[PDB]
Amino acid sequence: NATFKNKEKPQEVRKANIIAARSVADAIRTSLGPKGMDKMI
Amino acid sequence: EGVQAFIWQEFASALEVIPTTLAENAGLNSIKVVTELRSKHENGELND
């Protein structure tokens, strides 16, 4: 069948941004709850 | 129906992140905690 050509590649930028956001979220995740791990910066 | 069902299923699966993180930070077995919570929710709604 025929669908959109999708000549451009916005997927690369979108996936890079998603990866960065997920990395930040994973870094912040371990601090959830009263027993959350402390972070040193 | 359509992509809506799949995306809703993915959203529901992602919603379980919070209890998983709480179990991991508390030193409890994630699988055990989530299974027990789901089993207890057959009678309770939010108190468990």
Next chain:
Amino acid sequence: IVVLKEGTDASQGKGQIISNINACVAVQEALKPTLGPLGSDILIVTSNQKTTISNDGATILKLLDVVHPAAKTLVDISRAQDAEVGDGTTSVTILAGELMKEAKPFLEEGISSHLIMKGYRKAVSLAVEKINELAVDITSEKSSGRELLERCARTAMSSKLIHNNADFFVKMCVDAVLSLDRNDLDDKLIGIKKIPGGAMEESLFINGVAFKKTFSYAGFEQQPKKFNNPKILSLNVELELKAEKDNAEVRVEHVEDYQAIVDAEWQLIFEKLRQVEETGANIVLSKLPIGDLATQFFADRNIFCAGRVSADDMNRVIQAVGGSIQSTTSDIKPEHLGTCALFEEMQIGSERYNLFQGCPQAKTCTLLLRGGAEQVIAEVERSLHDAIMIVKRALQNKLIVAGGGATEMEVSKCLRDYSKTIAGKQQMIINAFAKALEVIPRQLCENAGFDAIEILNKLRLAHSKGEKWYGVVFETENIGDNFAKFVWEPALVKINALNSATEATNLILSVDETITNKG
């Protein structure tokens, strides 16, 4: 002009011992998933591209054959254990690896290997003593070499048709293995025959071998049905008025000549039948049909005969009576005649069944089953087969210890208790050996998917009080008395495995340097 090391040197001392420890750790990690019936398999590809997937430790070790000298020593010890015993190879390798792991921190702290080896030897002695103490050999506690087999048979028949009547079938199953050579047990030596009619509780245990009716010629019920001094002799190809084997087709155009030839053959058969009596053969058996003439002669001479005997039944009867098979009557010898206390035909089931009883020297036996239908007897036979296998396995090693890590837990507890009374440097080695002995249950739990930490903690807490048979239950994740569940392992196998593991540990830790020559 010849150099073997190619100018390459190597260090010596604690460094080589640590390298050997690392090699042993690698081997232990490689063989870890294969421990226990629930362990994972290992896939190995040989230089010939042949792919083999197996869980047996011996096969994995043979396929790998790690070139490292410490790994070579471990493989040699494992192969020796497998050849001498055949069980515990993987456990021996795991124990050796764990001991090598425990030895590493002591070496890092400056503890001489001699002290470690001496402490391991003392721990082995204590463990052997404690295993011998824990080994179960009791008479007055409602268990023994025979009662324990009855309990095992009852457990095997649990949740079966004859479970309610196991009180009688357990004795039959135990006697079946005990009725023959106790040092050489084989399931093929315990036969079962299905006889319709009567209750299941009326099943009869035959010391010898029994089989259904096979004679259907003239003279039935015209021969003695009971013998007090029977002589069993299997004659191959006679028992006929006309030769059956090595014969030929004879065509005669004159009645007189044919009659004369037939009369001569009949006279020869008469002489052979007389010789049969002259040989003292009171019971005549053969895999081929027996003619009317032979049966009539035997009946007139108070001799019992039965042809068309199956090969398996004939062989079992010969082995039970201690006789043999004779090609011809003229060659029958007294040494080929077997004797039993009493031979008789059983009328149970509205049919006569031949059986030999009162022959404790027989190498095989037969079980006679009764019931109202063939299906019930078949279920009884299946239950009896299961019970026979279980009791045979139990009797092969009557000296047993609690399985599922119970023996390891008990030995570790005893070693820890002793370490409080062995004040000195040996305390560290005793504690290390006790901790290492706990690897087996840990790896068994890990391979089974159980929570190793929680199970080990609960087992340690429980074993401090109550019975010494507490272990890990691999059916449902929990702990309990494995002995009460009829789960145990041979004491001698465990002792040999511990000895082999400690021998490997001492041999590897006793090497300070290795030199390799080019070749």
Next chain:
Amino acid sequence: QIFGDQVTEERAENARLSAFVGAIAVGDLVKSTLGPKGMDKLLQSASSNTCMVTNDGATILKSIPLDNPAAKVLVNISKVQDDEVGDGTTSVTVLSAELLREAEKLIDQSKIHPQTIIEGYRLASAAALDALTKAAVDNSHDKTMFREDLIHIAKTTLSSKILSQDKDHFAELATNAILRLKGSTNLEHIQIIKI
């Protein structure tokens, strides 16, 4: 590593890229030779002592080695033209290359399996063949001369056969069985009764 002997499956992206582009490139070997006014192509041997220049598409395709498997498949499939007609191989190759290029462009615009493309090509080919049949003309005027030629040919073919018993009768029968059909001449349209 898969398969062996330098015969391994290529990545899906590169596999499809080869399958399309390499097959299309075969046309470029014969595209310039299409038509009576086509150009010439030089084929040079390794020794350079047997080089020659030719404008025949079939010769160019069969002489130049093709390392890409797609080109091999395309040439092997197009070889049917030589047996069926014996001419126009250049046109077959050019048309196949153009169809493959258009399909590749469509896939780049859809990125979906070409099964729908295959069905569309089937429908378009059927329509084009129907139009060509409609646009055809008949040069069979003077059908009496054609009938006489058919009679002569039948008589020639019946020689040395069992049918030679009545040569004229069987020639007339054979000629009629083809002429009176006014359509397909396949043997399925002609029935033989043996009594």
Next chain:
Amino acid sequence: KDQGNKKRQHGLEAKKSHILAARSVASIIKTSLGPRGLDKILISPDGEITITNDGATILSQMELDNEIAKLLVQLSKSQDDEIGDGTTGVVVLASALLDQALELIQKGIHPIKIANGFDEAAKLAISKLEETCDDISASNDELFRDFLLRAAKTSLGSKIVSKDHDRFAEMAVEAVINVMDKDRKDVDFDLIKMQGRVGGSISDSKLINGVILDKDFSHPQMPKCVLPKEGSDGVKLAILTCPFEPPKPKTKHKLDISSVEEYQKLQTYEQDKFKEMIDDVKKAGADVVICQWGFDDEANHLLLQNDLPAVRWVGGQELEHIAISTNGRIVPRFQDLSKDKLGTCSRIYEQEFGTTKDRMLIIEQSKETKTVTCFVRGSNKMIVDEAERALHDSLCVVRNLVKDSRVVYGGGAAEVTMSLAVSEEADKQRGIDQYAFRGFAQALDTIPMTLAENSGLDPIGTLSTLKSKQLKEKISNIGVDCLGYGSNDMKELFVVDPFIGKKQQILLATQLCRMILKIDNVIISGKD
């Protein structure tokens, strides 16, 4: 041993590497699933190019160094005989199960629990299939035969033979009927010989009720046919294994003639042996002499003079086929030959197919026999290979249908139903079982999505529509547009897959998943 150039993975990358290798292997034939699956080019090391979408053929010809991939391919090779047409589906299902097991392990689930849960899910899916299965043979014999023919036609239509595939389906059905009895309802493929050659057309297919024995009759003057002799009792066959020659030395031989005495002695011995053999043959009353070995010049001359056509070098399996078809027996030697052991057949004649001029010899019975041969011809080698593969698939499908009256419908409808049932049951079982059931349902969802993708349809929307139709309205047989169809609901399209076939597919997929998952350490040495 061979420590150098040795690689291993264990503890960190073993599971991920194995699952990735399995996924890569599956992707080779994933796009080829379904009747409209895309083809793959397979090239022999000699440069012979072939085109086919058969997953079994693609995997069988693929060699690789990966251990997990090698194990998967080896298992598929054995499974090809069990099912044949389900290799690609089983591979895809196993790959999906491994993909789900990857996530399950990432969540902290031990592989043994994953395997046990997958086994339980397979049991539940098989139970659901049994509950939802329909019986054709118990409804109408005419409908049962119609469905058998429809399955054969569907199998054949994917190949070039689609133009005249009816003949192939009829021949396959006749062969199954002749060879298979209803006592066991199992087709003995060993008694259904597959043979063919390049040439002719698809309409030259013929079903033979006996062995072919395309032999040249040794001597050029030996008659090439054995006629029924104008209504006589068929043709009497001498089934022999001893060579038609006297004993000879194995060291020197060179039995040359130097004088009259040696000539006379050697001729006496050889002629006596040949005369004994030929007289035994004549007394037996056999019309055709069949020997497992060749024939000597004197034996050939004697047979020609006595009008006894000879058959040379007949294999043991061929001898067994002769005995079965002709109700005869194999005689070890000439001296043991008698009329009581000779076989009977309608005729032994030469049969021409299309334009073929070989005039192959065929033994024909024209009656019902326990052994038959499926003869396949075609204008090209590819046509013959495709026809043979389609005939094998049709025979397997017919065997499966006859063995079990319960059947399911293709197009993924059974997969969707199993996925729905497993998903419903997952919420009822607590613990790791819930995750295992959800993973199994998701893996089952893969097959319909792959079929939709191969058909140009959107897997997401197609799967969602199938689930909605099979859940909100009722349980039915609704699948994807594998072929050109007016609409969904295969139940009205007569796309039927045997229940036993689907059960075997699921069981084999589960077993393969367990085999791959249960390996936690791989060791490979170097190469010389």
